Amino acid sequence: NLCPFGEVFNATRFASVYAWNRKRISNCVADYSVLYNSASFSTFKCYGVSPTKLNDLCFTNVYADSFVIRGDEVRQIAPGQTGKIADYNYKLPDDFTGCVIAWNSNNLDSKVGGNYNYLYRLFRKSNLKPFERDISTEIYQAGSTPCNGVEGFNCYFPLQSYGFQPTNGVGYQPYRVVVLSFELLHAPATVCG
Amino acid sequence: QVQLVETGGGLIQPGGSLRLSCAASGFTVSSNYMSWVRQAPGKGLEWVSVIYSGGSTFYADSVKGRFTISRDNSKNTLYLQMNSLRAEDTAVYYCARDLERAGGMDVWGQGTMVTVSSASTKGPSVFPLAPSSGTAALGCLVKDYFPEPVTVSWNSGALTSGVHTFPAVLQSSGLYSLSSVVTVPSSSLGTQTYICNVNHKPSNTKVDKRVEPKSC
Amino acid sequence: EIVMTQSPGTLSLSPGERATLSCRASQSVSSSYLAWYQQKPGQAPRLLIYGASSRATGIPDRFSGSGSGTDFTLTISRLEPEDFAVYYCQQYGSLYTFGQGTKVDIKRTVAAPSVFIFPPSDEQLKSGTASVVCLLNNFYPREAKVQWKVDNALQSGNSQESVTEQDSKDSTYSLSSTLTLSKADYEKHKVYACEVTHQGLSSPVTKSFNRGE
Ligand SMILES: *[C@@H]1O[C@H](CO)[C@@H](O)[C@H](O)[C@H]1NC(C)=O
């Protein structure tokens, strides 16, 4: 039928960035008309693809990844970036082909007194490879003494809360992000405009 | 057990180069957010550079393209390579560990001093600040020396009461200037000798200057 | 560039009083990314508070923190003699920036400075430069203005100031101001005056001399 973009975009819940959600889009026609011609997006940037041309193309599969970050971090959802999000939460490859879409969701995802449901990974020994998803909750060992599952000095829970409050500045407000990857394989195409 | 110790500070010329080291104990440098923070004489704290556990580095605008932060995991040591140094890089450089929401910058070193100057070593000229014709005030103006520090005493250490030795100021010429004064009973001006002892080790200069009322 | 501004610049209190230091961010930042540090002369900073209100390890209970949005507060409920130092706020949500700091003063009754003026010595004059020195002795509080006048012309941009740390016994400050001229210009003028303004003076006090006398 029609590719179920609404299930992704108009979803009541969104994932924390460290456990970002991925929907696989196959065997349907995708019209990007609603997305490119909606005035409700803070960010709509495409790489290796032009948005108008999207309805004139065909891919093996499309991937829709979804999560929440803060505004100042949306710039890290792009090829070749660095920072806590790009390094330890969600990493785009340098040859990325697809589009990043983001919109302010302060009305949905912020709570007076702090919304502590949305998390980000703060500690990680090494960088993420592109499209890697790390859901570990092992205690982070910042020294040479083993932590053994208990928090303490040099032994920290690797995930931290954003604590979105509606009073935050726009750079610290939650933004919902959808990353569309258009994958080109040597196989029959199943997603078209 | 937890210790950050900075080394490598010294005097260097503008356009020069220097590499600061920060040896760590009690935590692993490569496992942490590690920062350099500097403090110019008499001013506040200015963040300089940071390296993430994963290798990402970031820099303050005032050092971009001139400073480079790095680390050696084998020696558990953080480094700051500083090129094209300017006079305003003169500061104490601290090395610090950051925990962000998990606990801020909880571990600091005690810092190493970096001085960037065109000036060559030069001993101070010592002039009297003569009491004018209750309380009398007299002193010594210790002018045009480099580098810091100088030490000033009065009567070879016997006279300490009422002595104020002021922090040096850096002059437009790149040389330092300082004053040390003392208030005494006016009557004492007739019965007591006052000599200021100025020692500047970097030029091995030692001056003993007597300060007396000028005669009208 | 997030700018942090602390207020006031100096806080004057006695041991046992309550200290309230304010920090304002130029942009709204989450309380998650706010910290307070203490610094004593010659020592490195020491973390007091992280995440706006969480005390760090070892920090006594008299230290508390609060705030949100652009305004944050550090509170020392009852001041101990150890608490007299400088305090910086910091945001660490977008790299790191600090405030200019707030100094906590040992308070005492207002005391006016004793003012002295020193002409240049003949020896320094032989070398071609003239340094005139004005001393402000044992005053409280630190705020003090020194106005150099040369033949009643207000001088600006040719003097430098220095201030001592608060005295450990009488808790006063001292200041020294130096006016520097060439001998050629020093000998073009007669009256050299230093005018001092301070809370303990109902009127500005002027100390002067005439060159050649
Ligand atoms: C989400 O709901 C709005 C309003 O009904 C609709 O216009 C939009 O197309 C929906 N989401 C998408 C893009 O499918």
Numbering used by the authors:
A (entry chain A): 334 to 526
B (entry chain H): 1 to 82, 82A, 82B, 82C, 83 to 100, 100A, 100B, 101 to 128, ...
C (entry chain L): 1 to 27, 27A, 28 to 94, 96 to 213
Paper text:
IGHV3-53-encoded neutralizing antibodies are commonly elicited during SARS-CoV-2 infection and target the receptor-binding domain (RBD) of the spike (S) protein. Crystal structures of two IGHV3-53 neutralizing antibodies here demonstrate that a longer CDR H3 can be accommodated in a different binding mode (mode B). These two classes of IGHV3-53 antibodies both target the ACE2 receptor binding site, but with very different angles of approach and molecular interactions. We determined crystal structures of two IGHV3-53 neutralizing antibodies, COVA2-04 and COVA2-39 (Brouwer et al., 2020), with different CDR H3 lengths in complex with SARS-CoV-2 RBD to 2.35 and 1.72 Å resolution, respectively.
Similar to typical RBD-targeting IGHV3-53 antibodies (Barnes et al., 2020b; Wu et al., 2020; Yuan et al., 2020a), COVA2-04 has a relatively short CDR H3 of 10 amino acids, whereas COVA2-39 CDR H3 is 15 amino acids (Kabat numbering). COVA2-04 has only two somatic amino acid substitutions in the heavy chain and one in the light chain, which is encoded by IGKV3-20. COVA2-04 mainly uses the light chain to interact with the flat surface of the ACE2-binding site and the heavy chain with the RBD ridge, whereas COVA2-39 mainly uses the heavy chain to interact with the flat surface and both heavy and light chains with the ridge. In addition, COVA2-04 binds to the side of the ridge, whereas COVA2-39 binds at its tip. The binding mode of COVA2-04 is very similar to previously characterized IGHV3-53 antibodies with a short CDR H3, including CC12.1, CC12.3, B38, CV30, and C105 (Barnes et al., 2020b; Hurlburt et al., 2020; Wu et al., 2020; Yuan et al., 2020a) (binding mode A). Previously, we have described the germline-encoded features of IGHV3-53, including an 32NY33 motif in CDR H1 and an 53SGGS56 motif in CDR H2, which facilitate interaction with the ACE2-binding site of SARS-CoV-2 RBD in binding mode A (Yuan et al., 2020a). These motifs are also important for COVA2-04 engagement of the RBD in a similar manner to other IGHV3-53 antibodies in binding mode A (Yuan et al., 2020a). Consistent with previous structures of IGHV3-53 antibodies that target the RBD in binding mode A (Barnes et al., 2020b; Wu et al., 2020; Yuan et al., 2020a), CDR H3 of COVA2-04 is highly buried by the RBD and the light chain. This observation substantiates the notion that IGHV3-53 in binding mode A has strong structural constraints on CDR H3 length. Among 17 ACE2-binding residues on the RBD (Lan et al., 2020), 16 are within the epitope of COVA2-04 and 11 within the epitope of COVA2-39.
